[PDB]
Copies of this chain bind each other. A is one copy, B any other.
Amino acid sequence: VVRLEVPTPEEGFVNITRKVEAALSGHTGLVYLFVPHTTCGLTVQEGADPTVAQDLLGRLAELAPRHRPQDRHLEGNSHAHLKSLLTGVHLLLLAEKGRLRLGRWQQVFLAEFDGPRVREVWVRLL
């Protein structure tokens, strides 16, 4: 497995498409991605129009508000745990000659919900 280091903001979708492809070495086949974290996730979504990620983050904040009196996990990041579960922490994608095989408007994002930090993303070719 190849380990990528990805600095992240307090909250946001970090495009890691190029960093991943940089670890493919001309690979044509499947690519496994995994984040060994519980308060961030991985997703494939549109990046071309920056307002898409804006609305995704905004809407997720409404489904998973930071403020919840009933929360028992007082450290305060239960909202991030929920966002991570909803998004997912692993991906499996296809690549062609070192490039991720994605749709017209797709980019690979490390969705940070509890940063800022330097997150790790594991990459494995198969």
User: Can you pick out 21 interface pairs between chain A and chain B where the beta carbons lie within 8 Å of each other?
Assistant: A30-B32, A36-B102, A36-B104, A38-B46, A38-B105, A46-B81, A49-B73, A51-B71, A51-B74, A51-B78, A55-B68, A56-B81, A58-B70, A58-B71, A58-B72, A59-B64, A59-B78, A60-B82, A92-B92, A94-B122, A126-B126
- Within A29-50, the residues touching B (CB, 8 Å) are 30, 32, 34-38, 43-46, 49-50
Q: How many of chain A's residues touch chain B, expressed as a range?
A: 35 or more
In angstroms, Cα B79 to Cα A113, docked, is: 19
Asked if A106 contacts B63 (CB within 8 A), the reply is: no
Q: Is A22's CB within 8 Å of the partner chain B?
A: no
Which residues of A13-41 are within 8 A (CB) of B? 30, 32, 34-38
Closest 8 pairs (CB-CB, A-B)? A36-B103, A55-B78, A51-B73, A51-B72, A38-B46, A54-B72, A55-B73, A55-B71
In angstroms, Cα B72 to Cα A79, docked, is 22
| Integer count of this chain's copies in the complex | 3
